Amino acid sequence: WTATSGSCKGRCFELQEVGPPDCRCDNLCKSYSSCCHDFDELCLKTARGWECTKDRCGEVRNEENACHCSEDCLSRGDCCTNYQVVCKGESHWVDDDCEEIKVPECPAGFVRPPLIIFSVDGFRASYMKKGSKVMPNIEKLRSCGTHAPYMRPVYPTKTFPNLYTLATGLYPESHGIVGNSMYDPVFDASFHLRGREKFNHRWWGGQPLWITATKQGVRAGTFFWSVSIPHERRILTILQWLSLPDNERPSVYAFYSEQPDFSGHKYGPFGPEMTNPLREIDKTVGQLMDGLKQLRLHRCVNVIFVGDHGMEDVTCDRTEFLSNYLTNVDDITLVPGTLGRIRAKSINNSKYDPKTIIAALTCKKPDQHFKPYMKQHLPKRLHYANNRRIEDIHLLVDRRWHVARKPLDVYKKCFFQGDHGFDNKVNSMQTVFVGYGPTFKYRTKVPPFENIELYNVMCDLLGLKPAPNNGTHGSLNHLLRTNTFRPTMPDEVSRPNYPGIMYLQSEFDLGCTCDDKVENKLEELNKRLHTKGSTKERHLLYGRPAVLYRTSYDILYHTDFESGYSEIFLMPLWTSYTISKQAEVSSIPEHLTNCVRPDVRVSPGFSQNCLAYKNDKQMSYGFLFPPYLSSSPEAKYDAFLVTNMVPMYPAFKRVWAYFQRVLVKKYASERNGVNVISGPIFDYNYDGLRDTEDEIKQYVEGSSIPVPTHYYSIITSCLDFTQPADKCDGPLSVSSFILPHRPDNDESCNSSEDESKWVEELMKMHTARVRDIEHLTGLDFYRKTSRSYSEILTLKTYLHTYESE
Ligand SMILES: *[C@@H]1O[C@H](CO)[C@@H](O[C@@H]2O[C@H](CO)[C@@H](O[C@@H]3O[C@H](CO[C@H]4O[C@H](CO)[C@@H](O)[C@H](O[C@H]5O[C@H](CO)[C@@H](O)[C@H](O)[C@@H]5O[C@H]5O[C@H](CO)[C@@H](O)[C@H](O)[C@@H]5O)[C@@H]4O)[C@@H](O)[C@H](O[C@H]4O[C@H](CO)[C@@H](O)[C@H](O)[C@@H]4O[C@H]4O[C@H](CO)[C@@H](O)[C@H](O)[C@@H]4O)[C@@H]3O)[C@H](O)[C@H]2NC(C)=O)[C@H](O)[C@H]1NC(C)=O
Ligand SMILES: N#Cc1cc(-c2cc(OC3CC3)ccc2F)c(OCc2n[nH]c3ncccc23)cc1Cl
Ligand SMILES: [Ca+2]
Ligand SMILES: [Ca+2]
Numbered sequence: 001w002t003a004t005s006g007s008c009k010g011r012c013f014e015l016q017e018v019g020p021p022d023c024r025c026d027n028l029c030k031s032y033s034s035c036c037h038d039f040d041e042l043c044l045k046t047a048r049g050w051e052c053t054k055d056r057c058g059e060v061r062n063e064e065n066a067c068h069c070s071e072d073c074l075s076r077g078d079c080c081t082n083y084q085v086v087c088k089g090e091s092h093w094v095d096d097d098c099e100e101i102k103v104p105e106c107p108a109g110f111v112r113p114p115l116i117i118f119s120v121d122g123f124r125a126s127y128m129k130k131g132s133k134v135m136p137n138i139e140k141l142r143s144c145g146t147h148a149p150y151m152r153p154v155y156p157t158k159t160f161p162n163l164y165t166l167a168t169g170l171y172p173e174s175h176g177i178v179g180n181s182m183y184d185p186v187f188d189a190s191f192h193l194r195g196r197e198k199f200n201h202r203w204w205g206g207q208p209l210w211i212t213a214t215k216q217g218v219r220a221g222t223f224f225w226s227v228s229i230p231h232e233r234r235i236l237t238i239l240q241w242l243s244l245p246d247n248e249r250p251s252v253y254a255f256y257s258e259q260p261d262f263s264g265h266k267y268g269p270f271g272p273e274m275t276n277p278l279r280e281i282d283k284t285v286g287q288l289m290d291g292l293k294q295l296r297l298h299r300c301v302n303v304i305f306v307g308d309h310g311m312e313d314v315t316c317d318r319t320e321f322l323s324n325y326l327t328n329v330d331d332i333t334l335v336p337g338t339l340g341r342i343r344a345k346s347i348n349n350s351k352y353d354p355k356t357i358i359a360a361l362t363c364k365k366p367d368q369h370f371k372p373y374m375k376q377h378l379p380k381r382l383h384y385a386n387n388r389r390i391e392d393i394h395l396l397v398d399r400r401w402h403v404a405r406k407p408l409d410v411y412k413k414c415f416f417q418g419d420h421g422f423d424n425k426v427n428s429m430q431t432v433f434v435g436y437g438p439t440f441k442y443r444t445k446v447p448p449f450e451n452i453e454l455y456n457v458m459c460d461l462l463g464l465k466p467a468p469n470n471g472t473h474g475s476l477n478h479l480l481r482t483n484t485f486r487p488t489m490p491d492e493v494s495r496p497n498y499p500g501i502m503y504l505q506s507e508f509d510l511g512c513t514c515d516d517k518v519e520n521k522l523e524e525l526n527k528r529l530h531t532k533g534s535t536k537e538r539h540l541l542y543g544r545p546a547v548l549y550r551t552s553y554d555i556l557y558h559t560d561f562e563s564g565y566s567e568i569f570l571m572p573l574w575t576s577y578t579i580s581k582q583a584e585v586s587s588i589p590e591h592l593t594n595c596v597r598p599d600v601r602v603s604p605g606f607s608q609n610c611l612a613y614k615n616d617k618q619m620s621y622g623f624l625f626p627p628y629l630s631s632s633p634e635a636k637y638d639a640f641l642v643t644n645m646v647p648m649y650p651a652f653k654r655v656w657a658y659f660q661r662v663l664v665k666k667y668a669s670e671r672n673g674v675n676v677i678s679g680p681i682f683d684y685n686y687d688g689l690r691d692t693e694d695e696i697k698q699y700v701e702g703s704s705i706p707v708p709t710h711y712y713s714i715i716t717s718c719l720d721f722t723q724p725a726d727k728c729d730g731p732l733s734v735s736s737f738i739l740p741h742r743p744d745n746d747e748s749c750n751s752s753e754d755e756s757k758w759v760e761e762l763m764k765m766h767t768a769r770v771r772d773i774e775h776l777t778g779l780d781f782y783r784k785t786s787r788s789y790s791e792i793l794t795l796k797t798y799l800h801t802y803e804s805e
């Protein structure tokens, strides 16, 4: 109940929220149905429109007008944004040549450059180039400031998940807003775009920038604008707030536009109808910049022009219907559209089975336009599993398609021609970033980066300490002129052991055999040196990874590779080797096919055994350093050491063998050598973080050998591919993956074909950042390069996406 009989007189767009039942004049009052009786009259004035004209210049102040052209308006902070242009002979900001902002040029009393975030809904990345002729203001920001060719949103590529990631630096799974629609089974409550429940504070995790600001003494404007407040009024309210006294004036502001998303859904991303919304957004940008120029703030404020996601062509006829797959279709609830989320209609039904639903959705039609997943099997790059609001069964929908339960759902709801929500590596979902101002660089292009990184930067721009988040602080230092955060490398927690020869062959009883009883002082000393680390400069190019948790491990050296071997997990944490452009692939000779060899540096008690693999009818084994790439027949024997073996389902061995036999060599050819780091990952609770020992749910039968959920590889070379990977003088180039260690290849619908038709496609889907691997392993890579640490941080956040341009 709102007692709506108080008044907004002098309180219009007040910053502090007053408490019920007393009536509100802040810009959320509309959304809560709680504005005072006179809010429209006083706070939403529209008389005479939004622009001065010649005949209004110098007018008598009339408090009814939407904005003012009277002589006192500058001092009142409430001129129309074009007042100086029309009435004082000034130019529009867009018509001024751009000039480097080397230092902030701020009015007296400004403690720090303010930040304005100008967010645009559905602003696809390619609009910057394709719409540039109708967006002159935006094009000046872009060309004069700092810009990326695009910015990667988070999954799902929906509004609230992306805007709240922008505000928190958190993945949706951690902030809680995992879709535009949600059920929380602990609350027994639903979240919708429509209506009231979405404003309850329990939905919203982490700490958004406005709270971070407030808690550290920095004042914030509103971030949420009610749909009924027009854009011109939003801008005027910001400019009014900027004219407040020093002690009252906020330092951080946001504008939001519902366009171009709104029109994009109706007309498609490049509909001829889309030109007008782009023109209109540019006009709003021009209003803000002119307004800032009038206030002498145009060379003082940092402006971020940022989108939440893109837009793709999607029509009603490109809909897959779950009723064409499942008999039981009425026993499920589907969250539909550009992604699918499935749960039981009733938790009173004990005959609901995810296994059989998944199986009925798997590779059932030859051109099937969605793929089902248990959420823990989704590509780890999506980070979309560790929340009770994310249903166990997920459907990744191909770009340009929808999924629905039944046909009736689509026609009893063709309207639309655009939608978004797809996989966040899809080109059509990419969005924009431009930074303009004293703290950003001048005429600088930066590589594409992920929107999870911006919270840290916005905190740096305002002198704030960021709350704990998923950005990698320092990875965006190259965007900034000053206010860099100077990160330092984490300290290594566990130092390795360096074991020598300590065990006789007969001390082992592993059940392994190898045909290797075959015998010189020249080459005896030589092989001794390889086991002491003589080739380690070649195979370990960037120093050894640091172990950032407490554990017990050994560095093992060999001719062709180096490893960090875990006495606790009984396998390497990592294995490092370099394959030159000239290296040769050979086969595993006939006599060595089932060869596994005791490692005399490592005790029986900390070794795997072959008997376990013999008795486990589901599990086989593979090798981290590939025997196919041995540098010589004699060196090949090292690859069969029990300390290089890892457990592998036969189905996964198909993937792994093709990677090691064919793809590594291909990459060495194409990239002029590669350095490879491979290893296991254990993430049984799908939190994206390294499991401790006591979290492992599966072992090789009868043994203490834990089964990885995933295998990783990091593949590094010289960005200047005219230099070989092992003699690179400059910046690096990386691609990585985290492959799920699965007992079937059901994910790949063409897996009965030759590995050349499906394995590389799988690996591309499971592309990863080095940083994703760091979280999953507790390892810190690239510790000894000749590059700056900031540059290395940027490298660690790189994602090789395999999209074209
Ligand atoms: C991305 O960045 C984020 C941010 O850094 C990373 O997330 C952090 O990860 C930490 C480790 O997983 C986690 O630390 C835990 O904190 C617990 C305290 O939690 C509350 O307080 C924090 C801080 O203010 C708050 O942010 C949390 O908010 C969550 O929950 C509410 C709803 O309840 C949501 O509003 C919000 O969206 C958020 O949800 C997300 O996180 C939770 C986990 O907290 C998930 O469950 C959700 O699905 C969702 O993803 C919390 O309100 C603390 O209690 C934990 O301590 C246990 O473990 C330690 C280990 O040292 C041990 O000493 C203790 O014994 C303790 O165990 C006891 O509880 C166990 C479980 O109940 C029990 O089994 C034991 O036997 C014991 O009784 C733990 O320290 C931190 O909270 C989150 N932060 C956030 C914001 O999510 C994330 O990892 C990054 N991702 C990647 C891939 O790198
Ligand atoms: N950084 C950031 C940032 C965050 C938000 C935002 C606001 C929120 O306010 C809480 C609900 C009361 C919640 C979550 C958000 F992420 C944002 O919102 C713009 C917006 N205004 N009006 C809309 N209507 C439909 C959808 C979004 C918005 C804009 C930016 Cl630049
Ligand atoms: Ca949106
Ligand atoms: Ca884990």
Ligand code: NA
Binding pocket: 612, 613, 614, 615, 616, 617, 618, 619, 620
């Ligand atoms: Na076996």
Ligand code: NA
Binding pocket: 745, 746, 747, 748, 749, 750, 751, 752
């Ligand atoms: Na298959």
Ligand SMILES: [Zn+2]
Binding pocket: 122, 261, 262, 265, 420
């Ligand atoms: Zn939309």
